[PDB]
Design a protein around this ligand. Sequence first.
Ligand SMILES: Nc1ncnc2c1ncn2[C@@H]1O[C@H](COP(=O)(O)OP(=O)(O)NP(=O)(O)O)[C@@H](O)[C@H]1O
Ligand SMILES: O=P(O)(O)O[C@H]1[C@H](OP(=O)(O)O)[C@@H](OP(=O)(O)O)[C@@H](O)[C@@H](O)[C@@H]1OP(=O)(O)O
Ligand SMILES: [Zn+2]
Length: 410
Amino acid sequence: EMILEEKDASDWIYRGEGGANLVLAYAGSSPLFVGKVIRIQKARRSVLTSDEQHLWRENNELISSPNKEVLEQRYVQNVIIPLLGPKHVDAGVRVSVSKEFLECVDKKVTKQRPLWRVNAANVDTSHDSALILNDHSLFSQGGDCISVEIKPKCGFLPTSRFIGKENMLKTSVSRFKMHQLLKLEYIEISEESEYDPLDLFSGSKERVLEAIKALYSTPQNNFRVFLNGSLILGGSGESTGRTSPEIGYAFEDALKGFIQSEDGHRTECFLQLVSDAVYGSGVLDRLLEIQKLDKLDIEGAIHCYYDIINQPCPICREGRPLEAELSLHALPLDESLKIVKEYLIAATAKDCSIMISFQSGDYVSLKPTNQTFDYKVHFIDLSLKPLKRMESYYKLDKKIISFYNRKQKA
Ligand SMILES: Nc1ncnc2c1ncn2[C@@H]1O[C@H](COP(=O)(O)OP(=O)(O)NP(=O)(O)O)[C@@H](O)[C@H]1O
Ligand SMILES: O=P(O)(O)O[C@H]1[C@H](OP(=O)(O)O)[C@@H](OP(=O)(O)O)[C@@H](O)[C@@H](O)[C@@H]1OP(=O)(O)O
Ligand SMILES: [Zn+2]
């Protein structure tokens, strides 16, 4: 029991954000909130639609959620944990908030937010609740703690019965790689990321290290590093441009004390440590199993979505009739519901992040520095994706592939 009022907004500072939630770390002195983060949902510019209630009917505690914050809490603990495991997942504790606290918080951090983020979304000041999670950038509560955030994205390729001849490049080239080309076009990134999510998930030592190095070279919105809660690499609530020579010098120096290596080598040693931690723990393996719940791709699943909402299928009837996916539409409701539900769970896994906390059971021995590091892994950002979003998923996919295709015509 706790109600945060307008005065409490002074005790929270900006940490980061995505497209759904704004996150703030504690900067006050209250013993009850020290070492915690606050996850506040944003409104873009009642709790579940009828069709969402039909889709999540097997989970009754889910469909009876009073607000959207409890819904997220019950989605993680009733759907995602039975799939990922409870060891590295925190569902978090609820806390009551006021309309004013939320408004003051919104205003407090505005200046530290990205310009375009301020444009698209602000905090939803109509919610009476917020999520309190453990601040993973702190090791627990030892000395210093270097923390690494990774947004791995999708690490498998569609193998589909349902991807057309004209989109067959989707079988060979990753979604992440293809998206980079579109992102660059809409000036959402400065340069094409060198990171290939197929390497990180490959379960191969040399390929994981290759992936970690690429995440250093072009962090964008996929790689962040924190010294004791303080951002020392990556973007602040957005994607960031290439690690320049200068960013490199600062990060190399920020590593002093923690990594015991001679100047100009602490970085290559640190990237060895992150690689060893990721590879050794195999925490990615079980997440790939959840991403693979998208078995038919959006070009397959889309047909099932129109069967679920009882709407005539546009894709089938507005295309060539002899190429209509009769296969999928012949499927019973229960089957149709299963595919789309598993697709939405996969989307959660495709969009989550991983935070590895390091400190001088789970441990790494760095031969080049002669040091030992304890580490903890936690999954974060395990949101429930709206069912309505299947339609925008198909449009986005159709936009990415066709733009990739016509670029290959050069
Ligand atoms: N428990 C935590 N400990 C430390 N940092 C956190 C924690 N939770 C969130 N963050 C930071 O806050 C940022 C945004 O949190 P996140 O849960 O990804 O918001 P989101 O808007 O739901 N993301 P997305 O839906 O992918 O756009 C992350 O990139 C983290 O750096
Ligand atoms: O659609 P994509 O795969 O690009 O993923 C986007 C994701 O939507 P999805 O996870 O529901 O698809 C968004 O999540 P919401 O906050 O809107 O819930 C947000 O995280 C974007 O930054 C992601 O773009 P990215 O920068 O990672 O490419
Ligand atoms: Zn169809």
